[model samples]
Structure formats: structure tokens, C-alpha cells
Target: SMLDDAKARLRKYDIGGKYSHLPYNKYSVLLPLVAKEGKLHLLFTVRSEKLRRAPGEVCFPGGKRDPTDMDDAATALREAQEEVGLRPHQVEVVCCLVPCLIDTDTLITPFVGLIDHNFQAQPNPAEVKDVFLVPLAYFLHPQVHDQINHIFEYTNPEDGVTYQIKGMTANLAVLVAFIILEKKPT
Candidate 1:
């Protein structure tokens, strides 16, 4: 199946990437996978508007390092549960992708995890405003985005709404699509 094939590709996603020498604080973000009708969908969260940093923007569920967390995967699982009620046990984490530099001082390790298809999100409003899913194929379609000053902006065709996928998240999304689709966006 295609889903299983993607799982195989992701299992060894690391290709001698490096960033550990940087002087940035560590954070972990999850690139959650939900399989539906034989296709995979990527999940995202709309951050609460009340928050200080990048409020109301869409992002993967993520958080700063917690002392009790032993590694990036653990931190990601915990944060996902905290923000969206995606439990740790329910996630069969596929891989730990290269970390993304965020805000010039934090490195977010993107963790890919497969969620149970039956699972439904229960967003925590204090931190998350809402939740949504984009088909894994979305980013693979190059024209779906507009470039402004080197930033990637995606406009939702369904609602005619726009959002900047900017920075680390945008690049990361593009990279993952390349791996899964096995072709450059055309």
C-alpha cells in the first residue's frame, strides 16, 4: 500500500543532517499523519490569538523542552497530547526529521507520527484555537502556493482564505512532500 511505502521512506529520513552545534534552545513539533480513505492527511493547529508569539497562526503542535522529556520524540508526543489530545500511545511515530530553526533561537525537531484513523481531535482552547487537515498531496502541487519575498503562501481553494506557511514549517512541508511523492513539485 502507498501508506506503508511512505512509512518505509520516512523510517530512514535522516541523511546525515546536522544542527546540534548551534546555540539554540530545543523544541519538538509533530507532523501528524492521519490516513483516510487510503490517502494520508497532515494535521495542523491554529494557535490561540491570545498568545504572545505568532498568535492565531497555523502550525504543527509543538512546545519547548520539558525537563522530564528524555528526547525529541517524547517532547513531541507530550505536546501533541497537551495541545490536541492526540495521545502518545496512539501514535506510532514514524521518524524524527531534521530540526527546523525557529525564531532565530529555537530548533524544532519535527517528528512524524501516524495517528489512528478513528481518532478525533479535542483542541485545548487555551493554546489552540482550532484544528485542520491538509491532504498530503496539497504541497506536492507547486501552483497551490504564491511566493512573496521568498516566503510560501498557500491559499485555501475551499474557503478562499490565505495563510503563510512561512519559515521552517513551509520548507519542512515541501521536503516531506518531495520524499513521499518522489518527484519535484511541477
Candidate 2:
């Protein structure tokens, strides 16, 4: 009876079939976390300076979805594997966040995954210049980092649609921390 009652309560806010309507070109990124010395760390990649787009920008391992990708999660996993040598079996996808429309008009979906602590990066020199980690708890303490407003209101270049959007800073790793804390086990 207790289990059934709990299920019934969950149905009140159930998002069973709701889906995101993404644009023609959608990108997916993975927030990979690993336990290091009993502390969790978020992994980041630095784009190669030789690249033309966003050269040397700090970002999570990801890319645009290919025709072979099954979904956003699949796209994220594939990109991580290609860019950072993260194996498919080395990560467990925990959840997905609402897709955000980037300033460039591309839809980007973020997937939070728990990565094996032993996972090592074999970055692709063409795409990734460097791979590094940040303390997971570092983002939780706002006092140590610059607090930038992530909210923005922009007009879509194509459809001329205006949207009010909010998101994390250039440091999207903080988003992984925020989501994990919200979904922490009791």
C-alpha cells in the first residue's frame, strides 16, 4: 500500500510523455564526473587553438548529433568517446536537462553522467587541446568564484521569436554539480 501510494503521488508531477522540440541542428554535451581521492571532480576539455571555432575555449566533451546517433544521450556519449577516449561502458547516464537554445541558434542538451574514476583522457589533438578536472564542491561555494548572471533574453534570428532564457556561466561544469546535488539520494 505504501509503494502504491508513493507511485500515485509521483504521478501528480509526472512528465511521462513531454518531449523537447529541438531545431534541425542539435548538439549534446556530457558532464563527466569521477571520484578522485574520495572527492568528485568534473572533467573539462580545452579546444585546440588550431581550430577555427571557439578555439581554446574550455568546454565539456561534445559535438553536434550525427545521423547515426539514436538520441541526445547517444550523441553525447559518442562525442565524449571520440574527443576524450571515454568508453561507452565507463559512463552511466544519470539524467538529462532541458535543452537550451544557444546564442548561435543551436539547441544544446546536457547529459549528466557518472564516470569511472580510472577513466583517462586520450584527447584528440585536432579537437581537444587539453583535458583537466575541477573540484565538484568548488562550484557549490559561490564565494570563491565569479558569480555571473546567466539569464538572457534574445530574439531568434530565423523565426524572429523572442525567448527569456537562463543558464550557467561559461563554466558549465557547475551545472553538473547543481543537478547532482538536487538529485542526491536521501
Candidate 3:
């Protein structure tokens, strides 16, 4: 029910704010991970500086699906594998969230999943800098998640339009709350 609530709110919330709809669509995925230590881990990566867009930024391990993919799920699974080595067999799919559209330009379909406590993760260095686990308790704690924000800048390659990337940072309270909302109770 909490997940349902989060899904409802996130669907309505404008993540990109003014940039809610661009002319094109770009797809992405989210992996809700839990480690063996009973800490709910969000499997994310700090992209290598070598990459082009958003290089070195913190993000979940996923990318756009291949044209040959059967469906969004298949694309998500395939991208997850190619990005982080997260095998399709390792996780039990939970539910897909309503597609979040960013200014009509991007369609980010977030997937929530669960894995047994015994499961292990292997991070790929080509795409990521390092890998580690963060305790769910730390994430859920209000004291640990103080809200913050920063300004970002992006250049429109096609039109040579330079724009301010506002709300480039997320409030810790908001992010951790979403994490809690995605997780299943033991």
C-alpha cells in the first residue's frame, strides 16, 4: 500500500519541473536492492568520467533498451545486465511504476525488485567507479537525510541552447522516503 502511495505521488510529481516534456523520449530503470546485512541497498553507480552525458554522476545501473527487446521489461533487464551485471535470474520482479515523463522528452520507467538475502552483486568497473552497500536504516533515518539542493547547467546540443539545470539535487528526506516506499516488508 505504501508502494502504491509512492507510485501515485511520483507519477503526478514533476521530476523535471519546467522541463516536463521534451520533443523526444528517453527510457531508464531503477533497481531496488537489499543486501545480506538486512540493509536495503539501492544499487547505484557513479558513472566513469569517460562517459559522455552525466558522466561521474550517481545513478542506478541501467540504460535504454535495445531495439530488439520484446518489451520494456526485457529492455530493462538487458540494460541492467549490460550496465551492472545484474542478471535477470537474481531478482524477483515486484511491480512496475507508472512511467514518469520528463517534459515529454524522457520516459523513465522505474522497476522495483527483490532478491534473497544471500544474493551477491558484482559491479562493472567499465561503467562504474566503485561499489558498496549502504544500510537501509541509515537511509530511512530522518536525521541522516537532510534536504539539500544545487544548481546544474546543460547545453542543448541540437539547438546550441544553454540552460540552467535546476533542482539537480534531491532532498534526502524525499529520496529515502521513496526508497522505503518501494521496499517490501519482511
Q: Candidate 1 lDDT, tens digit per residue, 19-107?
A: 54466798888998888766787888889999999998889998987889877678889999999999877898888787766577888
Residue clash pairs of candidate 3: 19-103, 20-102, 20-103, 20-104, 21-103, 21-104, 22-103, 22-104, 22-105
TM per prediction: 0.84, 0.72, 0.62
| Residue 173's lDDT in candidate 2 | 52
Cα deviation at 179, candidate 1, in Å, is: 1.2
Whole-model lDDT values for every prediction: 0.79, 0.67, 0.53
Q: Please give the lDDT score at residue 103 for candidate 1.
A: 71
Model 2 is weakest, by summed lDDT over 10 consecutive residues, at 2-11
**Candidate 1 residue runs with Cα over 4 Å from true position:** 15-23, 102-105, 142-164, 183-186
Mind sharing the TM-score for model 3? 0.62
Scored by TM-score, the top model is 1
Return model 1's CA RMSD, one decimal: 3.3
Candidate 3 structure quality by residue, lDDT tens digits, 1-186? 533443454445423223323444656565545654434555555677788888766665567756787655666677767766777787665555555556745766656555446555566777776444443443343233123845333333456543322231223323544646555565
Off by over 4 Å in 3: 1-24, 142-186
| Position 59, candidate 2: lDDT | 77
Rank the models by TM-score, top first.
1, 2, 3
Return the clash pairs for model 2, or none: none
Q: Cα lDDT of model 1 overall?
A: 0.79
Tell me the tens digit of each residue's lDDT in model 2 across 7-119: 23323432221343545478888878777766666777778999898787667888988989877889999999999999999997766765666676777777767787678
